[PDB]
Amino acid sequence: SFSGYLKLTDNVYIKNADIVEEAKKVKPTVVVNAANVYLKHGGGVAGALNKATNNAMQVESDDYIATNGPLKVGGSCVLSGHNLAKHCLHVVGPNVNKGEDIQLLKSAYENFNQHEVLLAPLLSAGIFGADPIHSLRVCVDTVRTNVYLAVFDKNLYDKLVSSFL
Ligand SMILES: CNC(=O)C1C=CC(=O)N=C1
Numbered sequence: 001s002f003s004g005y006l007k008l009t010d011n012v013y014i015k016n017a018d019i020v021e022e023a024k025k026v027k028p029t030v031v032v033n034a035a036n037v038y039l040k041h042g043g044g045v046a047g048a049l050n051k052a053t054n055n056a057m058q059v060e061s062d063d064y065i066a067t068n069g070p071l072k073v074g075g076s077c078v079l080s081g082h083n084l085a086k087h088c089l090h091v092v093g094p095n096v097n098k099g100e101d102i103q104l105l106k107s108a109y110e111n112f113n114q115h116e117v118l119l120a121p122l123l124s125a126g127i128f129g130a131d132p133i134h135s136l137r138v139c140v141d142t143v144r145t146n147v148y149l150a151v152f153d154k155n156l157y158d159k160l161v162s163s164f165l
Pocket of ligand 1: 018019048121126150151
């Protein structure tokens, strides 16, 4: 199972870890991807997860988009987890660098409540431009299921734990 996580609340855990490495080690039921509406996994968590699947995640995603059209900001879809997990929950947090409404971050985290346990990144953090401290607060106040957060950056991990209310 998950190891070395610090407990923040009843159901939220956090670790300074690369989510690709965590996924390859744990092989969780669900790994969350920090997706965009097009499921174009170019950079950040999405680029890293997709590269770990040898681009199979992108091939599957393009077929999903060809059939269904784009996701909504705040929405999600369940696809295969390939070599990383049983499933990948592609969740679209608002990209504040693209002027998307930050109020959609709570709607994005609500997708996690459909899964009993998830390995996840902080939504809208990193290249999505939101304040990761705010993302963690929305996570703890929205998600009721067991979420294991992998925070790639050590310095941000330390800041998140030390400032956690
Ligand atoms: C939770 N984030 C991560 O673990 C990342 C993010 C970007 C990346 O390139 N690789 C891993």
